[PDB]
C-alpha cells in the first residue's frame, strides 16, 4: 500500500452468477486441445496447458498481452467438451427439477394454479412484503380451466397492486427490499415448493405418469420403467393428445427434457432463481446446470511447484490433461459414428459405446471440480472444491487470516525500567523494520541523517523511494553515495505528472513509533495492544513490563510474542489512541482492572509505606 | 458485524436492529464503575467537575425536557409499587426511550435514577444536593458507549475468554462449558438435566411440601418390592 498511489474506483457489490458457454468462447485467449504440456527441446506445445497465449511461461513473452512473467497477469483459456456434462455443484438441483417435471406436456407435475401460487408468493418476497404473500392464500373463489384462470388473474392482480402500493411509499425500492426474515420466508417457500414438486406422482396438468429417475453417488442418472397400471394409463390418455395437434439416460436427454420445462415453466423459475427482482431481464436457461466448455485458468495459477532442485508437475494440469485425452477420444468415436448406416438392428452396442463416452468425460469433469464425486483410482488428486476447503479452507487460511510483512517474533523477557506502555525492541529488529516516511521541509533534517546512517546504523534507513515510483536501495552503498542522495531528497520534481508527489524514506523503527504486541491465543482484544517502541542496545529478546502480564496472560516461562509494525499514519493513530495499552486498563468483561504491579513491587510497598519506614 | 449505531441502537452489519439500546441504558462497561460510587464522586466533586467540563457543552444539550419527563415516570412508578408487573401502568415509558442520552441531561436509566435519588435521601451533607445531581447526570452522559463500538465481538470475547477458567471437572445439573454449549452452541430442545423450580406458598408447610414431592416423584414397582419367590 502506497499513499502516493490513491485509487479512484471501488467495488460496491459482488454479483453471483453462472458463466455461459458462449461467454467463455469469446473471452478465451486460446482453445486447449492437447493433453501434452511441453514439446521436445522444452518449448510449450501449441494448444496445450502451458500455451504462451495463457500467459508468459519459461522466459518467453505472453502471446496475448506481450508482457513477461512479472507484469503479465495471465489469461483464461477454454476446453471444448465434445458432449455436455453435468456441473457437479448444481447436479442435485438439476436432479430435483428433472424428477419434478412431466415427460409429456413438459410442465412440472404440480397443478399450474398451485405453481402460480408459489410464483406469486415468491414475486411478493423479492420485495420486503411477507404479510402480502400470506394474504395471497386468502384469495379463493376437478375444477374448470375458465374458473382456475380467473383465480390466476385475481392473484396476479393482487400481486401487481401490492407491489405498486408498496413501491409508491418507502416500503420497497425498484431493486427490492431484502432482510434476514425476508430471506427466511423465501428459503421456507423455495423448500416447500420443491417438496410439493417432488411429492406428485401423476401429472396434475395431463394425467399421464412419468418414469421415475434414480441416482448414484457420482453424477449419473437412470430411468426406472413404468408399471403395467401406469402403462395402461398412458394408452387411455393417448387420444386426447391427437386433438390438440432401469436404463441409463444420456446428459443430452436430461438437458433436452429440462430445456423445454425451463421454457414452459419460466414464470415460476424466474422468482425461484432470483432473490431480488431480475432487472437484467435475463432468461433462466437449463444450460446453466450443464457444462459445454471448461475454463482453463491462467498459467499464473497453474505453475509447476519447485522444491529445491526437483520441479514437480502442477496437480490441476494433470486433471486438465485427463479431460483433454477423453475429449479427443469422443471426437474420434463421433467421427466413426458419422462414417457408419444402412446396417443397424443391433443398436445395443452403439448406445453402450455412447454410455461409456459420456460416463468417462463426466468423471474427468467431476475429478477436476470435486474429487469426492469421481471413481476410485488404484490418495486422489484434489479438485477445485478441495483447493477451497484443503484444511480450514482458502477463506479461513488465506482471507480471514494472512501472513504479514513488517512483523517480528521473539521470546519475551521482563523489564521494570521501561514504561508500562512501552516495548523493549532488540536492535536486530530495529535495523530491519522500516516505516515509509515521506520527506518534507519539517523532517528533511531527521531523514538526511537516517539516509547517511544507512541500513546497519540505527536510527537509519534501508531504502529511498523517488517521486517517479522507483526504489533506491541503500544496502550496498557506502557513506559517500548516501551523503549524495541525502542532499537530493528535497529536490523539486521536474516531471509535471509527479509534481504532486514527494520522495519517501524507508527509515528504521524509531522510539516514537507504534507497534502491535500480540500473545497467542488472542482470547480477548486486550491480548493485542499498541506499545511504544523503545530500542534497547545489546538485546536479543523483546522486553516487556510486569503491568502487561495480566492482559496478555503471558508468563515469562519462555513465552513468545508477535510484534506488528503498521505502515501508515491512520494505522498509527489507531494503535496509539484505540488499541494502545493505557486505554485497556479496564477489561469490558466486568469493567475491572487488568493492569497493575505483580510481586516485588507489592512486597516493596508494604515495607515502604510502613510506619517504621523513615 | 453487530455494533453501536449513531442512533444509539445495536445494529447488525446489514442494518437489521438487534437491540434498541445497549443493555437498555447505552453505558460503556469500561466506564460503569464509579457511576454508583456517589460518596467517592462527592469527595472529588470539583476534581470531576473540572474533568467533565460542562462550559463547552451547556449550549449543545437540553437541561429540562428529560428531567421533567423523569419525574412523570417516577410518579406513575410509585403509584403501582405494590401492584404486579402485568397490572403496571403503560402510560409513560422510560425517559431513555423518548430522549437521546447524549443530547438530554436527565435521560438516565431508571436503575441509575432510583440509586442516585436514594443516595441524596439517605445522606444529608460547598456542594448542594441539586448541583451533585447534575454532576452525576453529566457523568452518565460521559459514560455512554461510542457509536461504532463492536459490541458483538466484545460480547463473544467477554463470554469466551472467562469460559477458559471453567475447563476443570465437577468437585447433578450440567455446569461449565458443556452447559454453555447446550445453550449458545446447540440450542438443545433435549437438555441433559431438564429442571423446574416450583415456588411453594407460605400456607404449605415443610411436611406438606415433602408429601407433595412424593406425590409427583416417579414410583416404580421395584421400589415397593422386598422379595420375589418363584416356585
Amino acid at each position: 500500500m502506497d499513499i502516493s498511489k490513491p485509487v479512484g474506483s471501488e467495488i460496491t457489490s459482488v454479483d453471483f452468477g453462472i458463466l455461459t458457454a458462449k461467454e467463455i468462447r469469446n473471452l478465451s485467449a486460446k482453445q486447449i486441445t492437447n493433453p501434452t504440456v511441453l514439446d521436445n527441446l522444452g518449448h510449450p506445445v501449441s494448444g496445450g496447458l502451458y500455451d504462451l497465449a495463457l500467459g508468459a511461461f519459461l522466459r518467453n513473452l505472453c502471446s496475448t498481452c506481450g508482457l513477461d512473467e512479472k507484469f503479465c497477469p495471465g489469461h483464461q483459456g477454454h476446453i471444448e467438451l465434445p458432449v455436455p456434462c453435468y456441473n457437479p455443484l448444481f447436479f442435485n438441483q438439476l436432479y430435483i427439477y428433472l424428477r419434478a417435471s412431466c415427460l409429456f406436456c413438459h410442465h412440472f407435475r404440480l397443478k399450474s394454479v398451485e405453481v402460480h401460487r408459489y410464483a406469486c408468493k415468491l414475486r411478493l418476497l423479492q420485495y420486503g412484503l411477507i404479510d402480502e404473500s400470506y394474504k395471497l392464500d386468502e384469495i379463493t373463489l376437478d375444477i374448470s380451466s375458465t374458473l382456475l384462470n380467473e383465480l390466476k388473474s385475481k392473484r396476479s392482480e393482487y400481486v401487481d397492486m401490492a407491489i405498486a402500493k408498496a413501491l409508491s411509499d418507502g416500503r420497497t425500492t425498484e431493486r427490492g427490499s431484502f432482510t434476514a426474515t425476508v430471506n427466511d420466508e423465501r428459503k421456507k417457500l423455495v423448500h416447500e415448493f420443491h417438496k410439493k414438486l417432488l411429492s406428485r406422482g401423476k401429472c396434475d396438468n395431463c394425467g399421464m405418469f412419468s418414469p421415475k429417475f434414480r441416482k448414484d453417488g457420482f453424477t449419473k442418472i437412470f430411468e426406472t420403467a413404468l408399471n403395467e397400471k401406469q402403462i395402461t394409463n398412458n394408452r387411455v390418455k393417448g387420444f386426447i393428445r391427437q386433438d390438440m395437434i432401469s436404463t441409463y439416460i444420456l446428459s443430452t436427454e436430461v438437458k433436452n427434457i429440462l430445456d423445454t420445462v425451463f421454457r414452459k415453466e419460466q414464470c415460476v423459475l424466474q422468482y425461484v432463481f432470483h432473490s431480488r427482482p431480475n432487472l437484467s431481464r435475463k432468461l433462466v436457461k437449463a444450460d446453466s446446470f450443464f457444462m459445454d466448455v471448461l475454463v482453463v485458468p491462467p498459467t499464473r495459477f497453474r505453475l509447476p511447484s519447485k522444491l529445491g532442485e526437483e520441479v514437480h508437475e502442477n496437480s490441476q494440469n494433470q486433471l486438465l490433461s485427463k479431460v483433454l485425452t477423453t475429449s479427443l477420444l469422443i471426437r474420434d468415436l463421433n467421427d466413426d459414428l458419422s462414417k457408419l448406416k444402412v446396417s443397424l438392428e443391433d443398436r445395443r452396442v452403439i448406445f453402450s459405446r455412447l454410455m461409456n463416452a459420456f460416463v468417462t468425460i463426466q468423471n474427468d469433469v467431476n475429478a477436476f471440480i470435486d474429487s469426492t464425486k469421481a471413481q476410485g483410482r488404484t490418495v486422489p488428486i484434489p479438485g477445485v472444491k478441495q483447493a477451497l476447503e484443503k484444511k480450514e479452507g482458502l477463506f479461513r487460511k488465506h482471507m480471514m487470516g494472512k501472513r504479514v510483512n513488517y512483523a517480528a517474533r521473539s521470546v519475551i523477557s521482563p523489564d521494570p525500567n521501561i514504561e508500562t506502555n512501552e516495548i523493549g525492541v532488540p536492535p536486530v529488529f530495529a535495523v530491519k523494520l522500516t516505516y515509509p516516511e515521506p520527506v518534507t521541509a519539517y523532517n528533511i533534517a531527521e531523514l538526511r541523517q537516517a539516509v547517511i546512517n544507512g541500513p546497519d546504523k540505527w536510527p537509519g534507513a534501508t531504502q529511498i523511494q523517488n517521486e517517479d515510483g522507483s526504489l533506491v536501495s541503500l544496502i550496498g552503498m557506502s557513506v559517500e553515495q548516501r551523503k549524495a542522495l541525502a542532499n537530493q531528497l528535497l529536490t523539486p520534481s521536474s516531471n509535471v505528472s509527479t509534481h504532486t508527489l514527494n520522495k519517501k524514506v524507508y527509515r528504521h523503527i524509531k522510539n516514537r513509533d507504534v507497534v502491535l504486541m500480540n500473545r497467542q491465543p488472542t482470547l480477548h482484544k486486550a491480548s493485542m495492544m499498541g506499545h511504544k517502541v523503545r530500542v534497547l542496545p545489546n538485546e536479543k529478546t523483546l522486553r516487556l513490563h510486569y503491568a502487561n502480564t495480566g492482559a496478555y496472560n503471558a508468563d515469562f516461562d519462555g513465552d513468545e510474542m508477535n510484534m506488528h509494525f503498521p505502515q501508515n499514519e491512520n494505522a498509527r493513530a489507531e494503535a496509539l489512541n484505540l488499541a494502545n495499552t493505557d486505554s485497556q486498563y479496564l477489561t469490558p468483561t466486568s469493567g475491572s482492572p487488568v493492569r497493575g504491579l505483580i510481586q516485588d513491587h507489592i512486597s516493596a510497598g508494604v515495607w515502604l509505606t510502613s510506619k517504621d519506614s523513615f | 458485524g453487530v455494533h453501536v449505531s449513531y442512533d444509539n441502537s445495536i445494529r447488525d452489519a446489514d442494518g437489521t436492529l438487534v437491540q434498541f439500546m445497549y443493555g437498555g441504558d447505552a453505558i460503556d462497561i469500561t466506564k460503569e464503575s464509579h457511576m454508583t460510587q456517589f460518596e467517592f464522586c462527592l469527595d472529588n466533586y470539583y476534581a470531576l467537575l473540572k474533568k467533565y467540563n460542562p462550559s463547552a457543552l451547556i449550549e449543545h444539550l437540553d437541561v429540562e425536557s428529560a428531567l421533567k419527563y423523569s419525574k412523570k415516570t417516577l410518579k406513575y412508578r410509585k403509584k403501582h409499587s405494590k401492584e404486579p408487573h402485568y397490572k403496571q401502568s403503560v402510560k409513560y415509558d422510560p425517559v431513555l426511550a423518548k430522549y437521546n442520552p447524549a443530547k438530554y441531561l436527565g435521560s438516565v436509566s431508571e436503575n441509575f435514577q432510583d440509586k442516585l435519588e436514594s443516595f441524596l435521601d439517605k445522606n444529608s451533607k460547598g456542594v448542594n444536593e441539586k448541583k451533585f445531581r447534575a454532576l452525576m447526570q453529566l457523568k452518565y452522559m460521559r459514560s455512554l458507549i461510542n457509536p461504532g463500538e463492536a459490541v458483538g465481538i466484545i460480547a463473544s470475547q467477554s463470554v469466551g475468554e472467562p469460559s477458559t477458567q471453567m475447563t476443570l471437572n465437577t468437585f447433578n445439573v450440567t455446569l461449565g462449558i458443556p452447559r454453555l454449549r447446550e445453550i449458545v452452541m446447540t440450542a438443545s430442545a433435549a437438555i441433559k438435566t431438564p429442571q423446574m423450580t416450583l415456588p411453594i406458598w407460605n400456607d404449605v408447610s415443610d411436611e406438606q411440601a415433602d408429601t407433595f414431592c412424593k406425590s409427583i416423584s416417579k414410583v416404580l414397582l421395584s421400589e415397593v418390592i422386598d422379595k420375589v419367590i418363584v416356585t
Binding site: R396, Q520, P521 | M185
Partner: peptide
C-alpha cells in the same frame, strides 16, 4: 507439548475434534 504450541502461530480458535464433533454428528 507446550514447546510446539510456543512456536506455532494458531490458524484459529483451537479445534472441535473432541465431544463437539460427535454433537455435530446429528442431522436435522
Amino acid at each position: 507439548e507446550q514447546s510446539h504450541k510456543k512456536t506455532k502461530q494458531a490458524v484459529s480458535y483451537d479445534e472441535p475434534d473432541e465431544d463437539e464433533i460427535e454433537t455435530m454428528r446429528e442431522a436435522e
